[PDB]
């Protein structure tokens, strides 16, 4: 077993889904598990697949970068779906070394150990209509290696400040 | 032919060097040509080994956000080492869609060819001392992918505003 990659961008060059579409089948396609660890998540819609996801049963596990994980929160509370009262959703931040803030520059989504889109796009509107991205889809054998790095991250992450 | 690829983290886990000594490392074996797109340039050790491969001779093409353009155009001024008189390097800018600035979010340094060092890693002080990242060291057959992504950027880039 090898590994497979094929490179997707925005705006799309010789494929027929945009990125977010991507995504967003990728979430509706997972059956058990969805891991994500992301700088900035703000969009609504994929956050709204990611609910949805979790309300069938898979099992949700979000990193996201401590210093912006207020946009988060801000974004669920306009969507009056609080990710606390969500039970398939386990969310916590990851720092890096202060001096200055000091960050989690990292971005991965990671589907059923199956499948994982690594690349410069973040879940945000300005990455749907205004910013130049790539990812990856990355099979086989490179996945168990981003299973490795999301379990490193969960284990020096924090529950939120905000969460009691 | 296929695709060989290794991890290397920031903090680094389970490899000798760092991602920055790799960088170094990179640029200093670079025979014939550097591929540089990235987000912010204002790191002076990696710029450096830049100015110094293009003495060597090796041909340097770098494509820099349009945005941040101007601190890497202050680090260059700082260290007394203008791009422009420089024969062998040639930088052009990069931006996305605007409303708000849209930014080219895109970073990767390909070499002769050969070689993709592709991730999270901006070439700055703070991925050296503050943050948490991770690339890809790419060779093969997704390296000829790298040098197509990157005559499209540079299809699309425009002589900084400066230069004249
Ligand atoms: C997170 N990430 C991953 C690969 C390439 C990138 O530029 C970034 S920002």
């Not at 300005?126 to 086989?140: C, D, N, P, R, Y």
């Given at each position: 077993?090898?590994?497979?990659?094929?490179?997707?961008?925005?705006?799309?060059?010789?494929?027929?889904?945009?990125?977010?579409?991507?995504?967003?089948?990728?979430?509706?396609?997972?059956?058990?598990?969805?891991?994500?660890?992301?700088?900035?998540?703000?969009?609504?819609?994929?956050?709204?697949?990611?609910?949805?996801?979790?309300?069938?049963?898979?099992?949700?596990?979000?990193?996201?970068?401590?210093?912006?994980?207020?946009?988060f929160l801000n974004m669920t509370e306009k969507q009056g779906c609080?990710?606390?009262?969500?039970?398939?959703?386990?969310?916590?931040?990851?720092?890096?070394?202060?001096?200055?803030?000091?960050?989690?520059?990292?971005?991965?989504?990671?589907?059923?150990?199956?499948?994982?889109?690594?690349?410069?796009?973040?879940?945000?509107?300005?990455?749907?209509?205004?910013?130049?991205?790539?990812?990856?889809?990355?099979?086989?054998?490179?996945?168990?290696?981003?299973?490795?790095?999301?379990?490193?991250?969960?284990?020096?992450?924090?529950?939120?400040?905000?969460?009691?």
């Amino acid at each position: 077993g090898g590994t497979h990659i094929d490179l997707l961008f925005h705006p799309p060059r010789a494929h027929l889904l945009t990125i977010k579409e991507t995504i967003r089948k990728m979430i509706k396609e997972a059956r058990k598990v969805i891991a994500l660890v992301m700088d900035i998540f703000t969009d609504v819609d994929i956050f709204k697949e990611i609910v949805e996801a979790s309300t069938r049963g898979v099992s949700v596990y979000i990193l996201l970068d401590e210093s912006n994980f207020n946009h988060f929160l801000n974004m669920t509370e306009k969507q009056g779906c609080s990710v606390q009262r969500l039970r398939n959703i386990r969310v916590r931040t990851v720092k890096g070394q202060d001096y200055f803030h000091g960050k989690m520059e990292q971005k991965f989504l990671l589907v059923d150990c199956q499948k994982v889109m690594y690349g410069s796009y973040s879940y945000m509107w300005s990455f749907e209509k205004a910013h130049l991205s790539m990812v990856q889809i990355i099979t086989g054998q490179l996945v168990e290696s981003f299973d490795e790095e999301f379990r490193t991250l969960y284990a020096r992450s924090c529950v939120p400040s905000s969460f009691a």
